[PDB]
Amino acid sequence: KSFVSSPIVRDSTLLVPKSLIAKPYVLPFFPLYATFAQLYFEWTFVYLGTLVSLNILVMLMPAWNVKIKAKFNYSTTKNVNEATHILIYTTPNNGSDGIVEIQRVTEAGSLQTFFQFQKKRFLWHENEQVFSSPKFLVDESPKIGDFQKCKGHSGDLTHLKRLYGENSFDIPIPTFMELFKEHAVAPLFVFQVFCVALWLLDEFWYYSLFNLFMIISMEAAAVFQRLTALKEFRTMGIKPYTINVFRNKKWVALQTNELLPMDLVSITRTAEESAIPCDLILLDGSAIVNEAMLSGESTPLLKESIKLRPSEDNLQLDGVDKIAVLHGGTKALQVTPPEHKSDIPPPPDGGALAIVTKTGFETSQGSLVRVMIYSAEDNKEALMFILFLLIFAVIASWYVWVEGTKMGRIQSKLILDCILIITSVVPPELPMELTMAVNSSLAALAKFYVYCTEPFRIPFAGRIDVCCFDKTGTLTGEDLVFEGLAGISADSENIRHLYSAAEAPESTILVIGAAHALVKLEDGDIVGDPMEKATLKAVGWAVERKNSNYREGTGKLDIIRRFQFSSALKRSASIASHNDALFAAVKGAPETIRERLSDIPKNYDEIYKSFTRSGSRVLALASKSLPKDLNRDDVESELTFNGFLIFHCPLKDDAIETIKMLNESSHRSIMITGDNPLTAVHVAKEVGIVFGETLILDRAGKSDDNQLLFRDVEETVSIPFDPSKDTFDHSKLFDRYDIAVTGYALNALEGHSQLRDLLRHTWVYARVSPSQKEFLLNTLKDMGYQTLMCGDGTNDVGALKQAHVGIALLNGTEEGLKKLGEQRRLEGAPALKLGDASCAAPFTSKLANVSAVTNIIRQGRCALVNTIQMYKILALNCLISAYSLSIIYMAGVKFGDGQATVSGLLLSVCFLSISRGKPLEKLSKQRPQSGIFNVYIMGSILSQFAVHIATLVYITTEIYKLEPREPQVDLEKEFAPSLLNTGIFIIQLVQQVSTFAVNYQGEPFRENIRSNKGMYYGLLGVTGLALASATEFLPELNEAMKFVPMTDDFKIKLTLTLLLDFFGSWGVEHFFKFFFMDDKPSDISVQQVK
């Protein structure tokens, strides 16, 4: 018997399929059918009906639960040589159970059984009799000699291709049937089809068939739209590109999909729209990677080789040995070929050779994406609404049935009346209205290039409480840019004074162009550190083919001999030559240059520490006159200070305004980043997330013991802390200082009693791992708030998936998108990359600016308002119609077709015009309501209904006082012009006007009613028709509308009753909205001065 062995599975039972007659429902039902046939050879037909129903239900019973499907279709066996399926019982926190097909294929005279569950390959090992996932060499504790003594793969590697598979990231998308099955369960669709069945049971067939066709077409179109969106956006951008791989003792060029562990490849300078293939270890050479996408840190690291380490005893640690690993999904800005000769020849390119370690969904990025996809996880308002309407319809049907029994009609007509009531309990224009609303919201979002794949999350963006943010890539760029010199002065009048350019003396502008490592090849190009290129271009230098560069606007320059950048004693050097004299320029970290030059200025330390404590990365450069080969020490004997070079990632010109708009709108915006605390605090303080002084929780000492320390940005205040003894002194910490928790401190405070009281008062989290953003969002969702996440990297994929509404900011300007669209149209500015963050986030702003959050919230407010107003109007109209049927139909009241159609057309015009409205430009501090079931809305609905009923009863009593009552009445008579018909129809029109005019108006969330031309014209027309027919202004139209003339006193009474009805309904609705509105922001949204 099989037994899968992995941390994902819990138990496993083999399965062998059963024949068609072996299925449980089919064999037994034959005795019941034979018994029914014998009894048959009236009341018995319902028995065949229920028997067919139960048979069809047992037929479809498996599809709901997979365990039931395995119980019914397949039978459990304990021999893997014959089982064809296997039931995988997963662990509690890893996806759900499943049925996967056991596959087989013969290789080299021996077949190999295997399957694949959650993209994790399994294989049948006979000696252990288990399905064991592949285990890699770097997973265990490997000897560094085992890595240094590698020479690539050789022979026929057809078993490795089966053990490990291919290096491909292929995400599967759902099909049409599995996507429509989710829409075929909502109560709206079930109620629609049930009502269609009830109606066709007695009414015609052609109209029912057309209606069913329409219902099918609506769902088909919706599912097709959702499927198109999913198929477009649910994928990561991974295009294979040729690389040189050392196989069979020769450098042969394979693709990226054909990489296996322990394969020697040659990585070069990674071009655009590409990244490092998979997890590599640097066997020889050097590089400068950019981990801003996978890790979240802005500075480019400097990786080194592995050859200098002793191969005998040392172990590949991934601790001290983390300066040699290159993850997958990072850009390599520069690569240096090997220096000395090795056993294998150097690569044909200029790249460095490395060793593959993991491939596919086993790497870091692949593992994050896989766990997000597979290991992931109310709709009761509509159900309660249907229950409400059905209760009222039941009371209506009970009354009408009692009255029909007391009058003496047949049972069939009473049944048909009950069915008519239950069918008209909901208007037919509800599903088309919901579809128009969803499509209008989607087409309004798609004007800012914001595409959504879960359209039911747009109403979620109306009551957002906490707005989380990512720093690198979302608020700031991920590339260092120049800022300007510093320290070039002798006045000390100010520290932060940045001479941009064209203001430095000749010495500084010669040193910035003399101490560099860029070179121009013979074909024409420039290779080197990109920040060095940026500064050399901003200063305005032009490099030539020879090492000598000129055309700086001042003169020419030549480089005699240059030095390298060492790992230790980090600095550089160069010996340049000028037409005037000769000097040697030095450029390196300031902490090493300060102890090297003779003349120490008075503001060296002040300027350095002022610019290094806030994000920026300075590079102090110095020079020295050199009179006429030489070593490096005597060149760096004594120098002369010249200035600094300050770089930092610049803010987006849209972040400040967006965060200000969110602050002035009762939103609490926080920051969750992976950068060091200083840069995060600086950017948050510059954008507007924190205002006053800020404290930081980080490790106090160095080694261990989890003892934190509250410390200012500077060295002013230092409050210790112990996660087992001390408790958060709210009075002196939270009221006087903003704070920012790091990742180590947030990890050491696990299990603390006041962790939530802390999380209620921190706005910046720096240096958090990809698995702590999920924890933070889960805690913020358990606290009761509604969260939002807006990021772009791979580390915050789980955070984007866990939030109530997630947004993934791609790259691309507006003009670039317009040009790309124009080119696409003509065929039918770098391109945009889909990345890994767009696979989890439902929304995906194809632009880069941060205003997508504001636009999405502004659309969510409008969508929620529209939903609430539609629910309220439908409830009121349905109650009024139910009463109208129940009571009025029991009297001799009926109208001709002409008046009915003439009024119904305007009613439908207004009802359709309701949905079309434009949201205001300004975000308001008041938030809409969440759901219809509360005190305010329900009270207002019931009170409006009571007022309408009282008015109708008053006019009925008045009319019965005027004209006789006629106790004997019949419901089969045809239409006859009378006074009661007019006196009721006028009030019907007035009530159907008031139910919109009183309940539509929402000022703070969308434009006024007068700006809605359609609905305004409709209501004006209906009220004008009613008021002109009441007082008989045009007798011709009254005689054309089959309205009988009336006396003056009754017309006056009717007009006064109309006015009183309208004004009373409006007044009591305003009363409830004024007394029990309760639109208050949360407690975390208030902003109090400290």
Ligand code: BEF
């Ligand atoms: F810095 Be963020 F987490 F991308």
Ligand SMILES: [Mg+2]
């Ligand atoms: Mg990012």
